Design a protein around this motif. Structure first.
Motif, PDB file in Angstrom:
ATOM      1  N   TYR A 175      40.844  63.371  24.708  1.00 49.30           N
ATOM      2  CA  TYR A 175      40.601  62.861  23.355  1.00 49.30           C
ATOM      3  C   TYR A 175      40.153  61.402  23.250  1.00 49.30           C
ATOM      4  CZ  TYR A 175      45.441  61.095  23.795  1.00 49.30           C
ATOM      5  OH  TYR A 175      46.569  60.428  24.161  1.00 49.30           O
ATOM      6  N   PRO A 176      40.493  60.529  24.225  1.00 43.08           N
ATOM      7  CA  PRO A 176      39.971  59.174  24.022  1.00 43.08           C
ATOM      8  C   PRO A 176      38.440  59.105  24.048  1.00 43.08           C
ATOM      9  CG  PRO A 176      41.754  59.156  25.649  1.00 43.08           C
ATOM     10  CD  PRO A 176      41.437  60.602  25.357  1.00 43.08           C
ATOM     11  N   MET A 177      37.822  60.098  24.673  1.00 41.32           N
ATOM     12  CA  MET A 177      36.370  60.161  24.705  1.00 41.32           C
ATOM     13  C   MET A 177      35.815  60.318  23.288  1.00 41.32           C
ATOM     14  SD  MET A 177      33.819  60.066  26.962  1.00 41.32           S
ATOM     15  CE  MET A 177      34.367  60.761  28.525  1.00 41.32           C
ATOM     16  N   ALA A 178      36.648  60.822  22.363  1.00 42.54           N
ATOM     17  CA  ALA A 178      36.221  61.042  20.968  1.00 42.54           C
ATOM     18  C   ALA A 178      36.567  59.859  20.057  1.00 42.54           C
ATOM     19  CB  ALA A 178      36.872  62.335  20.401  1.00 42.54           C
ATOM     20  N   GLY A 179      37.082  58.800  20.653  1.00 45.81           N
ATOM     21  CA  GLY A 179      37.541  57.658  19.905  1.00 45.81           C
ATOM     22  C   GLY A 179      36.471  56.621  19.646  1.00 45.81           C
ATOM     23  N   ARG A 180      36.931  55.422  19.315  1.00 44.24           N
ATOM     24  CA  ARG A 180      36.054  54.294  19.033  1.00 44.24           C
ATOM     25  C   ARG A 180      36.676  53.056  19.669  1.00 44.24           C
ATOM     26  NH1 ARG A 180      33.522  58.097  17.777  1.00 44.24           N
ATOM     27  NH2 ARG A 180      32.050  58.357  16.055  1.00 44.24           N
ATOM     28  N   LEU A 181      35.858  52.053  19.949  1.00 40.00           N
ATOM     29  CA  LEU A 181      36.391  50.777  20.401  1.00 40.00           C
ATOM     30  C   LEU A 181      37.026  50.050  19.224  1.00 40.00           C
ATOM     31  CD1 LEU A 181      33.600  49.433  22.715  1.00 40.00           C
ATOM     32  CD2 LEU A 181      35.579  50.772  23.393  1.00 40.00           C
ATOM     33  N   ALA A 182      37.998  49.210  19.538  1.00 42.64           N
ATOM     34  CA  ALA A 182      38.674  48.373  18.561  1.00 42.64           C
ATOM     35  C   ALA A 182      39.289  47.229  19.342  1.00 42.64           C
ATOM     36  CB  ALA A 182      39.747  49.152  17.795  1.00 42.64           C
ATOM     37  N   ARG A 183      39.950  46.322  18.638  1.00 44.70           N
ATOM     38  CA  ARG A 183      40.658  45.227  19.296  1.00 44.70           C
ATOM     39  C   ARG A 183      42.100  45.226  18.829  1.00 44.70           C
ATOM     40  NH1 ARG A 183      35.399  42.593  18.379  1.00 44.70           N
ATOM     41  NH2 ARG A 183      34.603  41.982  20.449  1.00 44.70           N
ATOM     42  N   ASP A 184      43.012  44.804  19.699  1.00 44.74           N
ATOM     43  CA  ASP A 184      44.406  44.652  19.310  1.00 44.74           C
ATOM     44  C   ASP A 184      44.556  43.307  18.618  1.00 44.74           C
ATOM     45  OD1 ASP A 184      44.684  42.594  21.281  1.00 44.74           O
ATOM     46  OD2 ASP A 184      45.752  43.895  22.663  1.00 44.74           O
ATOM     47  N   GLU A 185      45.787  42.956  18.276  1.00 42.45           N
ATOM     48  CA  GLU A 185      46.040  41.741  17.497  1.00 42.45           C
ATOM     49  C   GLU A 185      45.650  40.460  18.235  1.00 42.45           C
ATOM     50  OE1 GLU A 185      50.186  41.651  16.624  1.00 42.45           O
ATOM     51  OE2 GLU A 185      50.776  41.214  18.697  1.00 42.45           O
ATOM     52  N   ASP A 186      45.501  40.539  19.553  1.00 41.77           N
ATOM     53  CA  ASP A 186      45.173  39.349  20.336  1.00 41.77           C
ATOM     54  C   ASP A 186      43.706  39.318  20.690  1.00 41.77           C
ATOM     55  OD1 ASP A 186      48.030  38.918  20.361  1.00 41.77           O
ATOM     56  OD2 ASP A 186      48.099  40.457  21.938  1.00 41.77           O
ATOM     57  N   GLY A 187      42.958  40.285  20.154  1.00 40.86           N
ATOM     58  CA  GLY A 187      41.526  40.371  20.365  1.00 40.86           C
ATOM     59  C   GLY A 187      41.112  41.102  21.625  1.00 40.86           C
ATOM     60  N   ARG A 188      42.061  41.755  22.285  1.00 41.14           N
ATOM     61  CA  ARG A 188      41.756  42.494  23.515  1.00 41.14           C
ATOM     62  C   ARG A 188      41.197  43.854  23.120  1.00 41.14           C
ATOM     63  NH1 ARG A 188      44.174  42.367  28.901  1.00 41.14           N
ATOM     64  NH2 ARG A 188      44.068  44.410  29.928  1.00 41.14           N
ATOM     65  N   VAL A 189      40.060  44.225  23.702  1.00 38.70           N
ATOM     66  CA  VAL A 189      39.453  45.526  23.414  1.00 38.70           C
ATOM     67  C   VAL A 189      40.354  46.663  23.854  1.00 38.70           C
ATOM     68  CG1 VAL A 189      37.533  47.142  23.970  1.00 38.70           C
ATOM     69  CG2 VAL A 189      37.079  44.709  23.543  1.00 38.70           C
ATOM     70  N   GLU A 190      40.484  47.662  22.986  1.00 41.10           N
ATOM     71  CA  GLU A 190      41.253  48.865  23.301  1.00 41.10           C
ATOM     72  C   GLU A 190      40.514  50.072  22.732  1.00 41.10           C
ATOM     73  OE1 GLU A 190      45.118  48.236  21.668  1.00 41.10           O
ATOM     74  OE2 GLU A 190      44.425  48.220  19.591  1.00 41.10           O
ATOM     75  N   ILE A 191      41.012  51.268  23.017  1.00 40.98           N
ATOM     76  CA  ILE A 191      40.365  52.461  22.494  1.00 40.98           C
ATOM     77  C   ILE A 191      41.156  52.961  21.306  1.00 40.98           C
ATOM     78  CG2 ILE A 191      39.527  54.788  22.956  1.00 40.98           C
ATOM     79  CD1 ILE A 191      38.284  52.628  24.660  1.00 40.98           C
ATOM     80  N   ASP A 192      40.489  53.061  20.164  1.00 43.59           N
ATOM     81  CA  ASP A 192      41.081  53.619  18.951  1.00 43.59           C
ATOM     82  C   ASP A 192      40.830  55.107  18.996  1.00 43.59           C
ATOM     83  OD1 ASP A 192      42.157  54.096  16.484  1.00 43.59           O
ATOM     84  OD2 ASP A 192      40.535  53.117  15.341  1.00 43.59           O
TER      85      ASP A 192
END
Ligand SMILES: CC(C)(COP(=O)(O)OP(=O)(O)OC[C@H]1O[C@@H](n2cnc3c(N)ncnc32)[C@H](O)[C@@H]1OP(=O)(O)O)[C@@H](O)C(=O)NCCC(=O)NCCS
Ligand SMILES: O=C(/C=C/c1ccc(O)cc1)O[C@@H]1CC(C(=O)O)=C[C@@H](O)[C@H]1O
Length: 435
Positions: free
Chosen positions: A78-95
């Protein structure tokens, strides 16, 4: 310029419930190149013996069937179906938000698979992968885009663009090949393992090497048009290259990658006319799954790329393949558990990982990147209508970047796909066989 007409595009979503969550990315996930990694598969309509490869029901890469299997594959992946985002510290994560993946079909009514020749990753190939518009909104685009193109001959290409944060080659192909398995009607063998915290740094971080691989690449001591080509070396060519390196009783056998890489590095350095005292750095993506101890779960889904960076004066590299190969193999042999573990800690201590992202400035002259796909399952994607006759990169974004590909047949040859400045490529073309 080929006539390719896109039939139309569809967002494809997971076909069942998937977790709604933010997925933390590890250091190695964050320093791979930006944007979507391109790969292209070709399939012919007839097998070598000339039989039609359409299935009993007449199908041949039926879009509906492919989309159903895709939607099924996106449930465990399922992460393949997600989107990029950032956490509260600006680190890229997978939404992980089930935003879906792009799937589109196309027709090229005038062209055949034969028209692509040696399948070099030129712009001709890039057109077989959907184009992504990057804006400042990193959440705006799918992490996976796919195009299925149908040719005059009855053949098909599958072009894949996969955002590099999601997966490296092993995980990316694990996804594609699992999709293929479902489409073919067989269960896939290995469920993905989705949690990336297994690659978290130690606490406190305790790096114990300088990690040369994350330091800035050498500049010239002292814009250009960039050409792309592919070069095959037969098994016989490879053996003769290897036989040029003295075999001595003390000295352990160099890997084939190190021999071939030394040859490419030497030929590129000569073609570029590097002076003997010019430092040059070769970037070699290394699969950490084979090095971390204990090993990661089999289906670990993410990037596990560590980076070996042999670095020498060009005079050393051009003096001969034996000298270069020794330097490359030493750099490779450093990449053990202790070293890879230290790298995770080193990355954790960086104030900003965006600064370490590998890109054009990394690979350009006088330096080089040489990524091997030799041990990747690039030919295993059988969707139910046969195995591909070719698979390779759908383009090369950066001057100085190259790929080693295994043959699609059994002949033991290897191919080097590479981007260089146009003037340098004209020499490289000759030099790679001049031994
Ligand atoms: C050296 C390295 C960096 C790249 O080299 P590589 O081309 O992929 O291949 P490897 O060095 O791992 O192994 C190939 C060797 O095993 C041989 N081999 C073939 N089948 C084998 C099998 N079942 N078992 C063991 N060895 C086998 C090969 O013939 C070759 O032997 P040789 O070097 O003496 O010719 C390697 O450590 C690696 O990381 N491979 C994965 C690369 C990768 O993932 N790149 C990026 C994708 S994002
Ligand atoms: O080689 C890959 C990705 C392969 C891949 C193949 C098929 C897929 O579906 C997904 C990814 O990553 C490479 C990693 C890399 C680096 O500096 O780490 C540089 C380039 O050579 C990339 O292309």
């Amino acid at each position: 310029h080929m006539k390719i007409t896109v039939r139309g595009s569809e967002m494809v979503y997971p076909a069942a419930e998937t977790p709604r969550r933010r997925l933390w990315n590890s250091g190695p996930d964050l320093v791979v190149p930006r944007f979507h990694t391109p790969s292209v598969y070709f399939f012919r309509r007839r097998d070598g013996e000339g039989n039609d490869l359409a299935a009993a029901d007449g199908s041949f890469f039926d879009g509906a069937r492919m989309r159903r299997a895709l939607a099924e594959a996106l449930v465990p992946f399922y992460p393949m179906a997600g989107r990029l985002a950032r956490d509260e510290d600006g680190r890229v994560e997978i939404d992980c938000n089930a935003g879906g993946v792009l799937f589109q079909e196309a027709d090229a009514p005038d062209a055949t698979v034969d028209d692509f020749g040696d399948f070099a990753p030129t712009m001709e190939l890039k057109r077989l992968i959907p184009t992504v518009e990057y804006t400042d909104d990193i959440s705006a685009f799918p992490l996976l885009v796919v195009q299925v193109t149908h040719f005059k001959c009855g053949g098909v290409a599958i072009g894949v663009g996969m955002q590099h944060h999601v997966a490296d080659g092993f995980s990316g192909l694990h996804f594609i090949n699992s999709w293929a398995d479902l489409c073919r009607g067989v269960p896939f063998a290995v469920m993905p393992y989705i949690d990336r915290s297994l690659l978290r740094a130690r606490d406190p971080p305790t790096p114990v090497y300088p990690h040369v691989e994350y330091q800035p690449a050498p500049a010239m001591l002292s814009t250009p048009p960039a050409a792309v080509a592919i070069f095959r070396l037969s098994r016989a060519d490879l053996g003769r290259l290897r036989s040029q390196i003295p075999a001595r009783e003390g000295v352990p056998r160099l890997s084939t990658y190190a021999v071939l890489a030394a040859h490419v590095w030497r030929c590129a350095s000569l073609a570029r006319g590097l002076p003997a005292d010019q430092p040059t750095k070769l970037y070699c993506a290394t699969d950490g799954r084979q090095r971390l101890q204990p090993p990661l779960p089999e289906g670990y889904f993410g990037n596990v790329i560590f980076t070996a960076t042999p670095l020498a004066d060009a005079g050393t590299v051009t003096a001969g393949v034996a000298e270069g190969a020794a330097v490359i193999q030493a750099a490779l042999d450093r990449m053990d558990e202790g070293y890879c573990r230290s790298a995770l800690d080193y990355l954790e201590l960086q104030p900003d990982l965006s600064a370490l992202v590998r890109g054009a400035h990394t690979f350009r002259c006088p330096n080089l990147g040489l990524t091997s796909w030799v041990r990747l399952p690039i030919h295993d994607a059988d969707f139910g209508w046969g195995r591909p006759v070719f698979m390779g990169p759908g383009g090369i974004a950066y001057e100085g970047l190259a790929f080693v590909l295994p043959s699609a047949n059994r002949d033991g040859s290897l191919s080097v796909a590479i981007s260089l400045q146009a003037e340098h490529m004209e020499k490289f073309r000759k030099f790679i066989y001049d031994f």
